Design a protein around this ligand. Structure first.
Ligand SMILES: NC(=O)c1ccc[n+]([C@@H]2O[C@H](COP(=O)([O-])OP(=O)(O)OC[C@H]3O[C@@H](n4cnc5c(N)ncnc54)[C@H](O)[C@@H]3O)[C@@H](O)[C@H]2O)c1
Ligand SMILES: NC(=O)c1ccc[n+]([C@@H]2O[C@H](COP(=O)([O-])OP(=O)(O)OC[C@H]3O[C@@H](n4cnc5c(N)ncnc54)[C@H](O)[C@@H]3O)[C@@H](O)[C@H]2O)c1
Ligand SMILES: [Mg+2]
Ligand SMILES: [Mg+2]
Lengths: 258, 265
């Protein structure tokens, strides 16, 4: 299934990304590299032990750091020698810090995606592969409480769909997929109300926070592995209530000129 | 330079107003009778504005040199504008760059600039804070609606602007502030943004595809787009998204992307 495959996962020390890393290994992935800010060291020790015939590599790196990411990917390629799968999950919610939100959520995805390509492409010696970028349902349909976060999520979609063009695919053999999950119980929502732009919308946060138990990080991760098996270039998937929904995206309809 | 009455007695701010589209927006606002016009740009273009001031001697034309990426700078700039003008009715956020080789700059300017400007203006416009309400128009692009594979980073920022702006137009906010939020999405337009275009794309092997954009530059001008923008302002419809192509304005009827009709797979 994913046996013999080499994978990289940003945000792979926690939440959804952690479950992606775990499940990839449990699905028989040869090698798994984790790029994250947080150490979670005790957790990775036991993970190595549970997969003694599989490589588990952790690099502490901020995905916002372009050169850092570039360097990190270099280190991975020395060890791995090839990359088949990239899952870019890293992201934060903090609408009070615009610059950080933009650079992490949108720049991180881009930095990681672009840094991986030379080690994956059929041109430059690779065998091709797949990149899955973490967007959100709110990137598809704006959610008024969280405009800055949402903007970064919409950007990820546009970015990822672009790279899936036939022009690139024929040359690189790399596929590009976006996933858009709904509310999911993770540390991203810790102190959520403290981090929203408009304090007078604190009484509307229930709209998100009451739905967190409707799917888990593990559930979302299972849907992601499902998305990987489909291996369909340019696809966009919604992940809601533990299920995967393929989107057929149609261009916007235009009214008569005013 | 006949002065009309369309925007008579109104105070306006325009980011990116020293050149291209934004310049024409500034010019046309003044020609449409705007009381006061503040320009936020990296460049001052005094020679153009000295003459413009002279042609509009009863109208204020203020230029402040500021990078829209700079949060505090923009905040400070807005304070200065509010002290001078005394109130803000209209904001047109046009500032933006194309340079996909500089990801961080693209993100912070094109997306962060829109956000910084939009958020910095709200306290001076809102009814809940002594303002009279007003309108913000944010500059996206058609590529923000339908991705254009040559320019993924630029396009990402354009898509973001749409999502950001549509959020702020929620009835929840409007009732309190009386501020409206509108997005415009123009097609290709002959401007300095396309100078040295092909050297600024990410993937050099797509240089033979740039014609797809560069051959459409002649279908509408910076002045044409600006006229459509003033047209959008007159419509004054909260939450609206407009496409600007071949010198014409097209209102989009946006339907949600995620619906229950999809089957699980
Ligand atoms: N939880 C949800 O409701 C939900 C829904 C849809 C999409 N998402 C996406 O999932 C991602 C968040 O994952 P989560 O929900 O498990 O949250 P989480 O906080 O549990 O996990 C995020 C992980 O990313 C890492 N990270 C954060 N910033 C980083 C940076 N600059 N560099 C490197 N690593 C960094 C963190 O260490 C953390 O382990 C975000 O991209 C978010 O857009 C979340
Ligand atoms: N011309 C087109 O094809 C087209 C189509 C759709 C949207 N747009 C939008 O038009 C905007 C401006 O481009 P243009 O076509 O008018 O050409 P332009 O480059 O002449 O105009 C941009 C203006 O914004 C200013 N500016 C740039 N970066 C800035 C910053 N960080 N801070 C302050 N000011 C800054 C520049 O000095 C310039 O005066 C872009 O945001 C772009 O998204 C252009
Ligand atoms: Mg978590
Ligand atoms: Mg420009």
């Amino acid at each position: 299934s994913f046996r013999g495959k080499n994978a990289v996962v940003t945000g792979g020390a926690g939440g959804i990304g952690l479950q992606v890393s775990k499940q990839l290994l449990a699905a028989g992935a040869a090698k798994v590299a984790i790029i994250d800010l947080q150490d979670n060291l005790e957790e990775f020790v036991k993970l190595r032990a549970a997969h003694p015939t599989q490589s588990v590599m952790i690099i502490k790196m901020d995905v916002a750091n372009k050169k850092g990411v570039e360097a990190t990917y270099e280190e991975i390629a020395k060890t791995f020698g090839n990359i088949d799968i990239v899952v870019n999950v890293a992201g934060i919610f903090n609408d009070k810090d615009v610059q950080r939100t933009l650079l992490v959520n949108l720049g991180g995805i881009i930095n990681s995606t672009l840094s991986a390509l030379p080690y994956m492409g059929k041109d430059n010696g690779g065998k091709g592969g797949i990149v899955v970028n973490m967007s959100s349902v709110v990137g598809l349909d704006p959610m008024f409480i969280i405009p800055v976060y949402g903007a970064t999520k919409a950007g990820i979609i546009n970015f990822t769909r672009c790279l899936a063009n036939e022009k690139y695919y024929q040359r690189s053999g790399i596929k590009f997929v976006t996933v858009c999950p709904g509310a999911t119980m993770t540390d991203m929502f810790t102190n959520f109300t403290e981090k929203i732009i408009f304090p007078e919308t604190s009484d509307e946060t229930y709209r998100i926070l009451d739905r967190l138990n409707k799917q888990s990080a593990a559930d979302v991760s299972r849907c992601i592995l499902n998305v990987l098996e489909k291996d369909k270039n340019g696809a966009v998937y919604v992940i809601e209530g533990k299920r995967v929904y393929p989107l057929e995206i149609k261009p916007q309809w235009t009214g008569k000129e005013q």
